[PDB]
Amino acid sequence: KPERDGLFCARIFGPVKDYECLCGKYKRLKHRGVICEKCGVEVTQTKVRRERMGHIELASPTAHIWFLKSLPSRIGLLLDMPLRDIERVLYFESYVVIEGGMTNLERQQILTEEQYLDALEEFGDEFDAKMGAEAIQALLKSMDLEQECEQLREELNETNSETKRKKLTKRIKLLEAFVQSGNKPEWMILTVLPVLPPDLRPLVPLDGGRFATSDLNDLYRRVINRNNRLKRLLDLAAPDIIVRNEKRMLQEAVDALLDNGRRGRAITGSNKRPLKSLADMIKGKQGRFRQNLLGKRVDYSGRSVITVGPYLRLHQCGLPKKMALELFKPFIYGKLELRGLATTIKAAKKMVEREEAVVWDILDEVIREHPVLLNRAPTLHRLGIQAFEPVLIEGKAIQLHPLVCAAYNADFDGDQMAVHVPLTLEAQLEARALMMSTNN
Amino acid sequence: VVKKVNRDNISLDLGNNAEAVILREDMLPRENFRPGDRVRGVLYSVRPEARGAQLFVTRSKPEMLIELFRIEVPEIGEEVIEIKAAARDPGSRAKIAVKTNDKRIDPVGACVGMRGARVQAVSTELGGERIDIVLWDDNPAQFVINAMAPADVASIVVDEDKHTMDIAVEAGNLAQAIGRNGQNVRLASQLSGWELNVMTVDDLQAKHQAEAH
C-alpha cells in the first residue's frame, strides 16, 4: 500500500483501485466524488493518478540547474556576473554583498571568508553579504528589470567597440524578452519543487516483491530526504556551518534530479551507471521526443519475412492467412455480427478462435478491396512504404511483386518487412489513391 | 453517530452495525449535522420487515421531550411527577404541563431545578428550544389560563360545545401574550386542543353585558 504522505500516497495523488477507497470503506459508483475519513482519499477513477502532480516545499531556496549551466547561462547574462563566481556562491563557498551599502562594496561584488568577516568587523549593518541560493534569489528580486534595460539601452548608443556592443545587445535582448513576457527573475530559483505524477514513474513489480525502483523515485527520495533532514536541522538551533553544508548538499541533490549530467554523477547503489533524470526522460534517442512522440509504436500491424511470389499482379501482394486473421479481427467481428452468425462479440471471438469454415469466406470478403501498407526496415526515401491489395496465401511469408522489391531496395536475403492496415475510411481511400504501387 | 446527511433524511449508526435512519420531519429544521457527531433522539418507529432501513429515530415528536425529562428529572421516571401533556413547535418553543401526586413538591421549583438549570439543560441539549413549564390543572379554563404564561387574562369565557375559549390578555401585553407567530397561543390551542380566542379583556367581548351597560 502507498505509504501515507509518500511518493505514491493515495491521499495526495489518487486512489489505487478503480472507484474504491483505500481503507476499503467506499466501494461503489454511488460515491463518485466523496473522500473517505478512515484514510482520506477521493474515490474516483484510478486514471487520475496519471494526472495529479505533487509539490515539495523546499526547506530553503535552490537554483535551477538548467538556467545555471545552459550556455549561455540565463542567470549569468541576467546579472552581468561571470558564471564561475555564480557557481562559487551558489554552492556555499563564497559570499555576495547586496544593495551596496555605505561601504565601498558594489551590489554585484562577491566575497570570500576573510574579506567577509573583515568587512563584518568594519560594518555590522548596511552591508548584507548573503551566500547561497537564496542570496541569488534576493539579488534577482532586488534587480529592477526595465530600469537596467533602459539604462543599457541609452548606454549602447555611447560606447565602442562592437564586441562590448555585441554582448550588451545580447543582454538587452534578454532583458526585453524577459520583461515582455510575464516571467519574473526570482522564479528562476526554485522554492517549491513539483514532483511528477506517480503513475508516470511506476514502481513496476516482479514475480514476488522485487519491485523495480524506477530511478526517478530514487532521485525524489534522495531530495525529499535531504529536505526533511535540513528542516529538522533548521529547527534544532542551526549550527551555522552544518546547515550551510546541508543546504549545499540539498542544492546538489535537486540539481541531480533536474539533470544528472552536470556536477559529477548520482550513481545508483552498486550499479555503476548514472540515473535517468527528468531531462534524461526528454532528450536523446530514448527521450519522449524521438521515442514516443515523433515515432510511436503501432498496435494494429505486424511483420514477417518476404519471399518472392512472382505471380501476383503489380498492385497485389501476398499475405499469410495467420497474419490477416490476426490483423483484420475487428472487421471480421463486424462482418460476423452483420450476418448474425454470432450474436455476441464473445461468440465471434470464439468462432475466430476455432476458425470455422465460414470465417475464411468472411475474411476473403472483408478485404476484397481493402488496401494494406508494406514497409521496409530502413525507409530511406518515400517509396519505403507502399500500398497494395492483399491476397491470401499459406505459410508465413509475405509475397511481394519483384519490381517493387527492387524499388524497396529489398533483396531476399531474409530481409523482413512490416505490414500495416489503414482502418479508417479516409486512410483506406488515401492508400488506394496515393501510395498504391500503381501510383509510384 | 451518523454516516451521511441528505435533504430528506440522515443515516445513523448505533455500533455493532446497527443502522438507523431519521427522516426530515423528525429533525429540527436548523439542526446542523456532520459525519461524526453523536446525536441522540427517541426510537419512535421500527420496521423489522422493511425492504431497507428499519430503525426510525426522531427529535421533533413530543415524546422526545418526555424522554429527555425522564432521563433528566429524577422525580420523573418514578412518576412522583406525572408528565400530563406537552405541546411543541419544533426547535422553537415547546410548552409542557405536568401534575404531581405529592403535596410538598414544587413542579416549578423542582422540574426547573435551581435558578433555571434543569429545563435550561434540556433546552441546550435540544439545540436552542424555548420551553414553558407550567402546572396542569384539571379545569380547561384554568388550565389554558396557566398555558399562556407569561400572560394574564381577566375574561375567561368558555364554550365546551364549540371547543372555544375566549381567553384575552390585558391590553398591552398582547405583543408579548400572543407572541411571534402566536406561539404562546399556538401551543396553548394545541396543549388543551381547543380553538381559543385572545382578542380583548376589557371591551367589545361582552356584547350582551357590555351593550347592556
Binding site: 473522500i35 | 446542523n32 436552542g128 411571534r180
Partner: protein, 267 residues
C-alpha cells in the same frame, strides 16, 4: 488522519455557527449598534467571539488570537496566531439575509496553516489545510477550470468603508463587464473566497479588504488550485487589503485587463 489544530478550529467554528443559527431565528434577540459605514455590529458578534476564544483556550491556553473586536490578544506565545471572524457579512445577519459564515484560520511563523469557514444556513463547511488541500463537506475543491475571461462569473465587493475608490472601482467593473459574463455580490468576503475555491464563481476581486476577512479564505483558494495576488501581481495584498483570486488563467486575464483601469494609489 486530520490535522490537529484543524480539528480544534473546526469544532470551535461549529459551536460558533450553532450559536449564530440560534440567534438567527430570533429577530428580537439581536441588539446591534452601528460602528462603521452602513453596517452594525451585534451582541451576537461578542457572544460568538467569546465562545470561540474560550473553546480555543480550552485546548490552547497560550496561542495568540486576532479579531476585529479584541484587536490582537497576545498569548504567552506569539508564533501561533488564530485569525478569527465570528461573522463575515454582519450587514446580512442584520437583515437576516441567510448568507454569512464564521471564519477561523491559524498562522504559523506568519504562514497560514489551517483554515475553515462555515455557512450554518446551508450547513456548508469549507475546510482547508496546507499541503493537503481544501474540502467541502467531504468533497475535494479544485476551483473553476475556466481558461479565460469568457463566460466567467466574477465575485466582488463594493468598498462601503473606502467609497473614494468607487469611481475607479466602477470603471474597473465596467471594463470587466466588457468581457466577463456576470458578477456576484454577497457582502461576505470569506464565502466569496470559498465559492472561488469551490469552483462556484470563476474569480473574485475586492478593493481594500480587512486582513482577518481573507486570511482563512486565501488558504482555501490556494490549496484549491487557485492563486491570490494584489492588483499589481505582488504579494503585498495582506497590507493593502486589495485582493484578486482565482484560477491562474482568469487571474492573469483580470490583471492584464485591469493594469490600465486601475489607479496609482492602489498599485
Amino acid at each position: 488522519a486530520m490535522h490537529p489544530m484543524l480539528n480544534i478550529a473546526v469544532r470551535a467554528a461549529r459551536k460558533a455557527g450553532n450559536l449564530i443559527a440560534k440567534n438567527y431565528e430570533t429577530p428580537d434577540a439581536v441588539e446591534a449598534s452601528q460602528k462603521g459605514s452602513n453596517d452594525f455590529v451585534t451582541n451576537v458578534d461578542k457572544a460568538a467571539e467569546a465562545v470561540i476564544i474560550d473553546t480555543i483556550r480550552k485546548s490552547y491556553p497560550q496561542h495568540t488570537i486576532i479579531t476585529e473586536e479584541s484587536g490582537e490578544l497576545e498569548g504567552t506565545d506569539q508564533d501561533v496566531q488564530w485569525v478569527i471572524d465570528p461573522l463575515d457579512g454582519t450587514t446580512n445577519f442584520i437583515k437576516r439575509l441567510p448568507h454569512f459564515a464564521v471564519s477561523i484560520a491559524v498562522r504559523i511563523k506568519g504562514r497560514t496553516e489551517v483554515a475553515v469557514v462555515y455557512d450554518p444556513m446551508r450547513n456548508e463547511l469549507f475546510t482547508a489545510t496546507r499541503g493537503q488541500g481544501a474540502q467541502l463537506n467531504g468533497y475535494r475543491l479544485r476551483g473553476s477550470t475556466a481558461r479565460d475571461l469568457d463566460g466567467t462569473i466574477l465575485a466582488t465587493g463594493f468598498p462601503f468603508k473606502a467609497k473614494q475608490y468607487a469611481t475607479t472601482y466602477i470603471n474597473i467593473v465596467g471594463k470587466l463587464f466588457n468581457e466577463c459574463a456576470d458578477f456576484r455580490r454577497t457582502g461576505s468576503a470569506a464565502l466569496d473566497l470559498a465559492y472561488v475555491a469551490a469552483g462556484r464563481v470563476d474569480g473574485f476581486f475586492e478593493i481594500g479588504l480587512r486582513p482577518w476577512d481573507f486570511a482563512a479564505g486565501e488558504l482555501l483558494v490556494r490549496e484549491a488550485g487557485g492563486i491570490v495576488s494584489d492588483f499589481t501581481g505582488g504579494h503585498n495584498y495582506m497590507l493593502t487589503g486589495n485582493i484578486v483570486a482565482g484560477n491562474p488563467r482568469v487571474v492573469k486575464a483580470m490583471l492584464a485587463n485591469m493594469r490600465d483601469e486601475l489607479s496609482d494609489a492602489l498599485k
